[PDB]
Amino acid sequence: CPLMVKVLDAVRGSPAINVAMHVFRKAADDTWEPFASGKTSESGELHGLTTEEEFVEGIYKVEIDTKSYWKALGISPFHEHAEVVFTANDSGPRRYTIAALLSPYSYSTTAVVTN
Amino acid sequence: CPLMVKVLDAVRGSPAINVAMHVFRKAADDTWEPFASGKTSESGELHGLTTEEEFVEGIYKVEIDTKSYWKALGISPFHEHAEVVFTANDSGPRRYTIAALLSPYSYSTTAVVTN
Amino acid sequence: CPLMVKVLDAVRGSPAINVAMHVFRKAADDTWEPFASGKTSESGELHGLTTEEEFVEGIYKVEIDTKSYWKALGISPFHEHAEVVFTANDSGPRRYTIAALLSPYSYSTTAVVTN
Amino acid sequence: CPLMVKVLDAVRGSPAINVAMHVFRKAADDTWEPFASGKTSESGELHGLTTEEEFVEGIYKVEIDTKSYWKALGISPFHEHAEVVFTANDSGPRRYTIAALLSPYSYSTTAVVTN
Ligand SMILES: O=C1C[C@H](c2cc(Cl)c(O)c(Cl)c2)Oc2cc(O)cc(O)c21
Ligand SMILES: O=C1C[C@H](c2cc(Cl)c(O)c(Cl)c2)Oc2cc(O)cc(O)c21
Description:
The structure is a homotetramer.
Chain A: E1 3-9, E2 14-15, E3 20-26, E4 32-39, E5 45-46, E6 58-64, H1 66-71, E7 79-88, E8 95-103, E9 106-114
Parallel strand pairs in A: 1-8
Antiparallel strand pairs in A: 1-2, 1-5, 3-4, 3-6, 6-7, 8-9
Bound molecules: ligand 91C (2 copies).
One copy of the ligand O=C1C[C@H](c2cc(Cl)c(O)c(Cl)c2)Oc2cc(O)cc(O)c21 sits between chains A (6, 8, 97, 99-101, 108-110) and D (6, 97, 99-101, 108-110, 112).
């Protein structure tokens, strides 16, 4: 599993469940092309986004639909979504965990990169 | 000052000085049109981005060039930039401070809305 | 102002107003003696904690009563308080801002040291 | 596993490995009594701190020795340690994941509480 995303809710102290997200990869014409998508499970995790052969060098963007998550909870959030943009696999294949911690008016994101 | 941006550096415990950023506003055709830009000051703050008359309701994106900041310090960064996408809604007199705390492999952002 | 504390609320997107906190300094006998205290203002800031003559090198603890803050808003919090324990070292003229961003089940803190 | 701690390094984008920590529980005489301790593994995780029968209602403190972690990496950090203080099991047994993300001048902590 070369790319996994974990999302937590800082208000309820719980995984952020059923959070949608879309992964895009920058194309040659400098447009964002759809690469993968999914929703977080009961543990707040999204696995199986991609495979090692498909996940090539490039610039990728992970768009986490945080607005829809807060609104299904009755809260009106500040952000429309949380975006994470990074270059992947520039020095060879790595495993990437993108983690995000969400509040109505704030979020934090970090990456764990393993070889 | 209806919109201000403050950037801090979590590695050096200081304001993030000379950080470039661009502000975009969403267009009806689903494209980001340039709205404002600048570079943070010695206090890590960017003021005078916009005026009360120009800052209307809508979806705005702040793209902070974190990669150039870390490269200038000699530190290998994870993200291409830090993006903050938010809705500005008119409900009472609101001033927005967008604040961001930066690390090479992580960032956090929050909004301080006040009257 | 050699030491200032700023507290923000990540749920309401505002400064954390009327937050009580105590500052302790480590004693030779490994006990925390009271040093200063106060409550954050409408800007979420607590100024005038100490003077340059009193703020000597040492280990200091800032204990922020986050539990009372969340209870006042009607929100069930995880932490009893937020604690920030740090060394103040003399190397050039240093002013310390301790900043904290609060959520019910999470908090983040950073130091902004400047000249 | 009713209490687990996960620690990440925001500068290197990696688990924080071999981070020591000490868990204390508040006693009747309002002193902190030693409850459990360990070091994070290669994945940045500390499991096996306690058992469900031993982990009773009370106020617990988790002291993560962040200073020693940064110094074994050649960095001089701001904080002496990261402390997390919370009431556990007040409404019956829960499972607790305390997570921390570390920078030299900053850290964030959050809790996931499951039933
Ligand atoms: O801890 C802080 C405080 C920091 C801040 C500092 C100062 Cl001095 C200030 O005036 C304002 Cl508005 C904000 O903002 C943050 C943004 C963030 O995403 C996570 C954080 O932990 C913080
Ligand atoms: O963004 C994250 C997610 C990170 C995390 C990563 C993994 Cl892999 C994991 O299993 C768990 Cl429980 C938490 O924890 C955090 C702790 C924190 O103080 C601030 C954060 O932003 C985060």
